[PDB]
């Protein structure tokens, strides 16, 4: 019978400037490598350095997003625990250097399900764009500063809307279906004014 075996994580360590936040994903797995539903606790072992929170208040799922807030320069660890299992994830909070490059981050699964009845509902993609210094530290969230667009004229039957959603000083770019007739990839272009920063492909699926 399946038991929790691994608290899988998509980060080997968080690197963030003071005053910035960064995210990573947890996936609970059984001994066979399949998803396992269980609850999780997240704790910072030095809250004066960094604080931490977890999506869905850490209940009822096999996948969670952990958010780390850089409070003051220093190093610490995030401990993620479920039952007898734990993972300690390194955290480094730095002053932060000048911007070296950008990361286009997909917060969800990167998919929009144009089915009328999927459960759980899966009707968007959520994007952030980060500024990153030469050492790989997140030094800014520039999601509000960028413009994200798809092709002006549809050429593949996949049609999406992209809209900035801003509250309490935090911006997410939210992608939704806009009358897609087909499934497939749609290329989004990310620009800072007239400068192209990169592209990201979102996917429309249909699980009906
Ligand atoms: Ca999605
Ligand atoms: Ca749907
Ligand atoms: Ca299209």
């Amino acid at each position: 019978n399946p038991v929790l075996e691994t608290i899988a994580v998509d980060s080997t360590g968080v690197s963030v400037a003071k005053g910035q936040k960064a995210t990573f994903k947890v996936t609970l797995k059984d001994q066979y490598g399949n998803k396992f539903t269980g609850n999780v606790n997240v704790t910072s072992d030095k809250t004066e350095t960094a604080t931490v929170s977890v999506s869905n208040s850490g209940i009822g799922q096999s996948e969670y997003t952990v958010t780390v807030n850089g409070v003051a320069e220093g190093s610490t660890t995030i401990t993620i625990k479920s039952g007898t299992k734990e993972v300690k994830v390194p955290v480094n909070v730095v002053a932060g250097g000048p911007v070296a490059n950008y990361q286009i981050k997909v917060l969800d699964d990167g998919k929009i399900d144009k089915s009328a009845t999927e459960s759980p509902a899966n009707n968007d993609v959520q994007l952030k764009v980060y500024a990153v210094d030469a050492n790989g530290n997140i030094v800014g969230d520039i999601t509000n500063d960028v413009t994200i667009t798809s092709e002006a004229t549809d050429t593949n039957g996949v049609i999406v809307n992209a809209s900035k959603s801003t509250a309490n000083g935090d911006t997410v770019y939210v992608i939704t279906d806009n009358g897609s007739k087909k499934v497939g990839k749609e290329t989004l272009t990310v620009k800072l004014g007239t400068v192209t920063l990169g592209t990201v492909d979102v996917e429309v699926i249909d699980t009906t």
Side-chain angles (χ1 to χ4, degrees), residues 2-208:
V3 67
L4 181 65
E5 184 88 1
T6 300
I7 304 172
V9 65
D10 76 349
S11 178
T12 62
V14 171
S15 311
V16 65
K18 174 192 302 163
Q20 293 304 304
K21 65 190 196 275
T23 71
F24 65 89
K25 286 175 174 169
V26 160
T27 310
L28 301 186
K29 294 176 182 183
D30 66 22
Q31 67 268 54
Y32 307 105
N34 295 321
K35 295 207 207 83
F36 182 87
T37 298
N39 311 316
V40 297
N41 283 284
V42 296
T43 55
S44 171
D45 302 293
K46 234 168 203 72
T47 54
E48 77 268 27
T49 300
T51 60
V52 69
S53 62
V54 59
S55 69
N56 210 59
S57 299
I59 66 176
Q61 301 178 174
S62 56
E63 290 166 299
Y64 299 97
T65 294
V66 175
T67 296
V68 177
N69 306 291
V71 172
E73 298 179 43
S75 294
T76 192
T77 72
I78 303 314
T79 300
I80 301 152
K81 202 163 286 161
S82 188
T84 59
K85 306 292 172 194
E86 69 158 38
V87 180
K88 290 183 175 278
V89 178
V91 181
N92 197 34
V93 184
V94 301
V99 186
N101 59 22
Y102 309 87
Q103 290 172 11
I104 303 165
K105 180 94 185 83
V106 177
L107 296 172
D108 65 314
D109 69 351
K111 306 176 186 322
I112 294 163
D113 191 343
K114 66 175 187 71
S115 172
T117 44
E118 80 282 356
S119 188
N122 187 10
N123 292 316
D124 76 15
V125 171
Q126 283 190 303
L127 303 173
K128 276 179 173 292
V129 184
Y130 299 105
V132 178
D133 73 17
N135 288 319
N137 301 285
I138 286 171
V139 296
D141 178 340
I142 63 164
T143 311
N144 197 38
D145 301 323
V146 304
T147 306
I148 300 183
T149 57
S150 60
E151 58 181 357
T153 293
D154 177 52
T155 68
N156 68 343
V158 184
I159 313 164
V160 299
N161 275 328
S163 55
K164 288 182 191 158
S165 298
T166 299
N168 316 306
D170 182 73
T171 299
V172 178
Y173 236 114
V174 179
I175 317 304
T176 53
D177 188 20
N178 186 29
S180 292
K181 295 205 170 165
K182 299 185 204 275
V183 302
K185 298 296 181 83
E186 184 77 345
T187 300
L188 307 180
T189 303
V190 182
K191 288 195 200 163
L192 185 55
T194 61
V195 178
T196 301
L197 303 186
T199 64
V200 61
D201 281 4
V202 299
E203 190 184 356
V204 169
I205 66 170
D206 190 330
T207 61
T208 306

